[PDB]
From a paper:
The amino acid transporter SLC38A9 is identified to be a lysosome-based arginine sensor for mTORC1, and the ACT [Pfam 01842; a small regulatory domain found in Aspartate kinase, Chorismate mutase and TyrA (prephenate dehydrogenase)] domain-containing protein CASTOR1 is a cytoplasm-localized arginine sensor. Similar to the regulation mechanism of Sestrin2 with GATOR2, CASTOR1 can also inhibit the GATOR2–GATOR1 mediated mTORC1 activation in starving cells; and the binding of arginine to CASTOR1 disrupts the CASTOR1–GATOR2 interaction and hence GATOR2 is released to form the GATOR1–GATOR2 complex, leading to the inhibition of GATOR1. The structure of CASTOR1 shows it composed of four tandem ACT domains (ACT1-4). The recombinant CASTOR1 protein exists as a homodimer in solution as revealed by gel filtration and dynamic light scattering analyses, and the dimerization is independent of arginine.
The structure of the arginine-bound CASTOR1 was solved by the single-wavelength anomalous dispersion method and was refined to 2.5 Å resolution, yielding an R-factor of 17.5% and a free R-factor of 22.4%. There are four arginine-bound CASTOR1 molecules in an asymmetric unit, forming two CASTOR1 homodimers which have almost identical overall structure with a root-mean-square deviation of 0.9 Å for 570 Cα atoms. However, ACT1 and ACT3 fold together to form an 8-stranded β-sheet flanked by four α-helices on one side, and ACT2 and ACT4 fold together to form a 10-stranded β-sheet flanked by four α-helices on the other side, and the two β-sheets are orthogonal to each other and form a β-barrel-like core which is sandwiched by the two layers of α-helices. In the structure of CASTOR1, two CASTOR1 molecules form a tight homodimer via a twofold non-crystallographic symmetry. The homodimer interface is stabilized by largely hydrophobic interactions and a few hydrogen-bonding interactions among residues from helices α1 of ACT1 and α5 of ACT3 of each monomer, which buries 1 857 Å2 or 7.1% of the total solvent accessible surface area as analyzed by the PISA server. In the structure of CASTOR1, arginine binds to the interface of the ACT2 and ACT4 domains with well-defined electron density and reasonable B-factor. The arginine-binding pocket is largely formed by residues from α7, the β17-β18 loop and β18 of ACT4 and the α3-β7 loop of ACT2, and additionally the β16-α7 loop (residues 269–279) acts as a lid to conceal the binding pocket. In detail, the α-carboxyl group of arginine forms four hydrogen bonds with the main chains of Val112, Gly279, Ile280 and Val281; and the α-amino group forms three hydrogen bonds with the side chain of Ser111 and the main chains of Val112 and Glu277. The guanidinium group forms five hydrogen bonds with the main chains of Gly274, Thr300, Phe301 and Phe303, and additionally makes a salt bridge with the side chain of Asp304.
Author numbering:
A (entry chain B): 1 to 83, 92 to 154, 170 to 208, 223 to 323
B (entry chain A): 1 to 85, 90 to 157, 166 to 214, 218 to 324
The structure:
């Protein structure tokens, strides 16, 4: 098993909903126009609270400072396990990093699971994981060999979610709908779009999927729908460890698959829709 | 022949290039989202100076005031002559519409599109317009999308002058599009309009290039005026031309910003072009006027227009 430190230096941002209009011009650029910036890591998540942006240093330069725009304190590095679910790395990655006081942010996409850590913790990350993983650093597309735990409240909306991908050539065909959804539109709004290393991933409501032109959004498991578990009552911050470990741990022990996405304020786990009853019950035992 | 007063009340605006960030949200909406606006008249023209908007009262509400937004005084009414019974465009109406309105001191704004030629007049001038044109035209007013017969019914700018002209070397296309195919060109249209390098604002009788891009959605119909080089950026089988071979040269009519009060600017261009039977589309922007003539006729046009007095 290999751990890869990817060639991305990511900043974590919050755009306040009343001030999204101001970032329309830079965000349209990052969403749709790859020749217009050197951005290679772009992730946008809409929640009721805010729009969460995970973006590299180059994409970060597109976004001017304002009262509507929060920036998390550190530069984040991106981790990836190779040879689509967080359950499989709960014991090997998530729990050991939580135990060694390394704070994470999660980004599950259609393609793979990204684990983000702060630049300051890389030495601790390597030390913790060098024994189990062959650790590689991505340079020029080539692999090169190298704050107190709390039980958090959980809730599940009735929304049914799809984890989707797209042929990068067909992105222009969904542009107007994606613009409409993002900038102009128990229930909780959740919309995630990411463009990472040319790969498109979209997390979407079943009702929102109806708005898109047919036969463009692709998935290997068509009709596989996911229920959301929202994690935290208060805003979670970026210092507290063991939050992902509280969720992925019991789910791995029950052998239930999960996507995991961290927003600026809250954590979000996606579980198979018919297994939601088992999931709530399993997590109730912490 | 008939003259139709269309069912539109228009405001004329200028968004300065440095203020594009503030207006991207309202502009994208008006361009691509017909369900989210009651707007039935939207015209956007990119120049090096600005973005000129001609928009109805409903679309006008989407645009908040700022140091980057300039709005003309008047509410404008839209006139149209359907004439298909020889030279094309505003040349068809130079003698019948444009010259008489100038003589009776009615200031105009022109918007030639793929479909037809729109003549914009200030609301306060409608009585004079009808009186000037009733003898030649059967005048109708659009009410609920149906024609209704019209039987009822001081200068504050600079003196009329001969305005300096220049002809940029760009080759322009007048294009339409199936409205159902607008989503397919959206990203390219966005890229061209809002994210491209434009020609500097800072003389030449024939400059190499000027930035000029016109898009309009009026009563469901799309019109695009575009550089021939710019056309290559778009996907292949979507833009519709109706021309095989010959394109259009711009004559920019300028000097000082033309304002909205001086009359006889369109007349001093369209009048001689009619006398020389040259096809002309004519687009007014916030600051300047733009005549499009057949590219092979450009030498004749310049020669004709330099005999103005
Ligand atoms: N803003 C957030 N979503 N914070 C929670 C992320 C997970 C937490 N830092 C952990 O290491 O377990
Ligand atoms: N802003 C302008 N483009 N003004 C010039 C428009 C033509 C002028 N008002 C005329 O009646 O002849």
């Amino acid at each position: 098993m290999e751990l890869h430190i990817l060639e991305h230096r990511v900043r974590v941002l919050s755009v306040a909903r009343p001030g999204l209009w101001l970032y329309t011009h830079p965000l349209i650029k990052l969403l749709f126009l790859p020749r217009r910036s050197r951005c290679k890591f772009f992730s946008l998540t809409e929640t009721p609270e805010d729009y969460t942006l995970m973006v590299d240093e180059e994409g970060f330069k597109e976004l001017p400072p304002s009262e509507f725009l929060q920036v998390a304190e550190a530069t984040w590095l991106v981790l990836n396990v190779s040879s689509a679910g967080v359950t499989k790395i709960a014991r090997s990655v998530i729990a050991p990093l939580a135990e060694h006081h390394v704070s994470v942010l999660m980004l599950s996409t259609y393609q793979t699971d990204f684990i983000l850590v702060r630049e300051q913790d890389l030495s601790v990350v390597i030390h913790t994981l060098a024994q189990e993983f062959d650790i590689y650093r991505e340079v020029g597309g080539e692999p090169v060999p190298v704050p107190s735990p709390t039980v958090h409240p959980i809730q599940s909306p009735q929304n049914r979610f799809c984890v989707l991908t797209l042929d990068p050539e067909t992105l222009p065909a969904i542009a107007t709908t994606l613009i409409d959804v993002l900038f102009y539109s128990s229930s909780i709004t959740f919309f995630a779009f990411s463009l990472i290393e040319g790969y498109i991933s979209i997390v979407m409501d079943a009702e929102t999927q109806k708005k898109f032109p047919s036969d463009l959004l692709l998935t290997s498991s068509s009709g596989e729908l996911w229920r959301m578990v929202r994690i935290g009552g208060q805003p979670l911050g970026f210092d507290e460890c063991g939050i992902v470990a509280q969720i992925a741990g019991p789910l791995a022990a029950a052998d239930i698959s999960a996507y995991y996405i961290s927003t600026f304020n809250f954590d979000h786990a996606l579980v198979p829709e018919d297994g939601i009853g088992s999931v709530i019950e399993v997590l109730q035992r912490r």
